Symmetry: D2
Subunit: 139 residues, 4 copies
């Protein structure tokens, strides 16, 4: 079960009222909202994009998540982030959700960005800013 | 257009990727998620509830919002909160969303809680903890 | 309590698992999702826009809702829609959510579109297709 | 690319205005909302639970999705569902989203339920109604 140390960058995301579903914990779907929020915050601040903005955007082609221990609004949650592999027009992220002050991830997942030209949605090489920012998150 | 000073308690809520809709700003529906997140965080920390928890819960019977200037993930947003009137089993909140470092609210709204017994959903007097916490937010 | 026949156009919206919150009913915030889903669907089929395409878009400047009886996934909900006032760059919608087939509205709400130039977001006259479509919904 | 007939049970889900994100298609995260909406609807009609009522509930322990072609509100989407493995307190669902009427799946995904006692959240044998219903969806 993944550990804080195995991740390079960390982001706190506040939990919301309706994050809880009928069974009292954060809905399993919400984890992915946390995933792509966490990644794109990093791409925005440390990487250029430009979501309003640029002619290059990231498209999610796959994701997946595993769930180990539940969590609940209003607990304070944070995301570890790391980059696993990094092709030319694509990249693969590893994310995990940590409850504040815990060594053990509550869930952990991966997802894959393909960067494309906005209008054409055809793949492109990753612009240097982003590619360097992305690289900085590699183990 | 409502001002920071006119509100008693303030809460920062991080914005999320998909808070933006097709037109590039935070969706108008999301403001209400911010409203009830903000209120219930306060009720949870400073008031008792106990959403897992208690035999008394808050039901939203009305809300409404006005929108003045747009805002966007990943901007950092915060909620002013104040209590306007406070009956016996009910209460009326005034909320506004502020972009960090701005005097002017970007939107502002109200909503009404009726507190009820969990099982019976029949109104109750507000328990002393909550009532005192609520009162503390009165002008 | 608003009734089915006080409304001119109806859409079915399917409820979703996470529509329900911790307390077991559709969250109050989801009601507004139903509202602008329901309006915008009408605008799209019977009115022109062109949400990717158009040079003119609708901004929500205000909204409000009242809640009468709760509802839950997986019930079958549907939306009554009517138009109340119709200025020249502005319009006012009246909405009610009905559970199938009950005559009484579960909740009822209002909201306001202002149409603007996409780029400049400055108000404009409502294009004839839209205004014709809108007026169609006037009582 | 998974095809309609590789799936045993189908549900229509209506798309919603905010389904689309800043880039104009249904957000990748919404796909999972469709998944557990679609499973849970089946469990509710054809299988017993009893999400308010029941002493046994389904936990999502994992999920994954692949995206092939994008989609947008207000298109008409529908979900193929089939069951892959079926242990005794566990089950594995296979899901695909289809745009009406195309033979190719827009995206395809998997997810895992583990059934537990509501209070103790310790695994249990799947109640005969559910397991009968589940097995019905086995290829």
């Amino acid at each position: 079960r993944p550990l804080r140390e195995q991740y390079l960058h960390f982001q706190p995301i506040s939990t919301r009222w309706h994050d809880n579903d009928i069974y009292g914990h954060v809905n399993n779907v919400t984890y992915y909202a946390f995933f792509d929020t966490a990644v794109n915050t990093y791409l925005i601040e440390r990487g250029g994009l430009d979501i309003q903005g640029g002619e290059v955007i990231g498209l999610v082609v796959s994701s997946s998540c595993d769930y180990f221990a539940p969590v609940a609004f209003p607990q304070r949650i944070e995301m570890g982030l790391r980059v696993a592999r990094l092709g030319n027009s694509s990249v693969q992220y590893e994310l995990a959700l940590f409850l504040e002050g815990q060594r053990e991830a509550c869930a952990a997942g991966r997802f894959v960005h393909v960067f494309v030209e906005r209008r054409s949605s055809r793949p492109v090489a990753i612009p240097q800013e982003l590619r360097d920012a992305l690289a900085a998150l590699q183990s």
